[PDB]
């Protein structure tokens, strides 16, 4: 069902990287990937969990919705997107870790480990998702299959806007586990297409911070080898 | 309120084109346009009708969701982007007539007409590039008289363009059977912490100059750091 391609390998080492790439053809329902065992291998969800995160914010009541504003507590980090008021939308798109940890407080670690396990996520973190695994979640979100409010799920994928042309839309979410060794960087999502949904999950070897762009572009590399986006 | 910055009209004679082009600034609640005159003149909604529309169509449940396929029905028209199935995101990418039709068809006049008058739209239905606007921002803000759901999944169907910048919610109009032919371009635009409603109309003589609806409008985006 998984057919391999190791044609795709050259994209990563192109870039000098390892990494995996899985597709998922909906209409067909055939997977494609470079390496099934790590495809099929466990990491750290790092930021590509602040997509079920943001179900359980939402379906819980903790966030009213896209509009609420949760503003900044003042404490001057690091990374200066994060130094400003947010909505779930902009909390989303620059991965605003101050944010979606009140979230988590506010919601409870013995709700969350229930809430994901509903999902059939994993298994701070707190749990580990493999490739496949990943895009098993995200068709779920597609079809509004979770059990949690379908507002949830319509409101969540809004928020995973990436990208969208008059060729396709992509709705994806980044990721990057850099506390254990190996580091490695998420990108996980789907390309909408007029008669198709493609997903993907990939992930690579991320040592750097300076490779994240790969994220992406060996991705898009592998979708126009495909034929998948012009 | 309601303020023309003339210098728009460069960008209209630059494509030996005429036409109006009407912004909203949400957050500071002031509007803008080329001509306050052609700004606030009615027209016939042609395409742009598709919206509200589309709300009537889900929250009377004719259809069922933006997935549900609507099969073509053999004719070849002449628009080729018609003759294939469609469903409500196809539907109005493609500003697919018939499918709309068969909607109409199933709703009827009558609910048609009490609906469309709860959102206040028209005044043989026109609507003026200003009105377009105080369309938009209702649905944009979820007050429309129709349930919630239904106005989320139309203003999915209207994305049009994003990246990193800006999001682009918009619905395209070709209206051409009695004179003159004109164009439309309504929607907005999501910045991170604004959004910008915009509604264009302008003379449409040949069918070729159809892209210069959204080259025009985006060319005074641009021109007013709404876009890169
Ligand atoms: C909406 O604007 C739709 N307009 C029509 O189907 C046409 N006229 O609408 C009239 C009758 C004027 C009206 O008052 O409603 C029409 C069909 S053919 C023609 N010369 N005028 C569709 N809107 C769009 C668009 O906004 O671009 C179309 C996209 N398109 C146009 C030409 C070629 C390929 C694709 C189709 S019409
Ligand atoms: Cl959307």
Redesign the interface.
């Known amino acids: 069902e998984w057919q391999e391609n190791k044609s795709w390998n050259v994209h990563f080492t192109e870039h000098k990287s390892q990494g995996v790439v899985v597709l998922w053809n909906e209409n067909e329902q055939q997977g494609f990937t470079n390496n099934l065992k790590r495809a099929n291998q466990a990491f750290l969800p790092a930021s590509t969990l602040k997509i079920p995160n943001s179900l359980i914010a939402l379906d819980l009541g903790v966030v009213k919705d896209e509009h609420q504003v949760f503003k900044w507590d003042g404490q001057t980090r690091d990374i200066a997107t994060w130094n400003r008021d947010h909505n779930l939308i902009?909390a989303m798109?620059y991965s605003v870790v101050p944010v979606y940890q009140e979230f988590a407080r506010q919601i409870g670690e013995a709700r969350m480990s229930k809430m994901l396990h509903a999902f059939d996520y994993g298994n701070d973190g707190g749990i580990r998702i493999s490739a496949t695994e990943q895009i098993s979640f995200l068709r779920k979100l597609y079809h509004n299959k979770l059990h949690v409010s379908?507002?949830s799920q319509?409101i969540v994928k809004?928020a995973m806007?990436?990208?969208?042309?008059?060729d396709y839309?992509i709705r994806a979410k980044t990721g990057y586990a850099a506390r254990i060794e190996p580091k490695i960087g998420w990108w996980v999502g789907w390309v909408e297409l007029?008669?198709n949904v493609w997903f993907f999950a990939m992930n690579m070897d991320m040592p750097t911070s300076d490779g994240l762009g790969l994220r992406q572009a060996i991705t898009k590399e592998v979708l126009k080898q495909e034929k998948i986006i012009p």
């Open positions: 902009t798109k379908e507002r319509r809004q806007l990436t990208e969208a042309n008059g839309i007029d008669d």
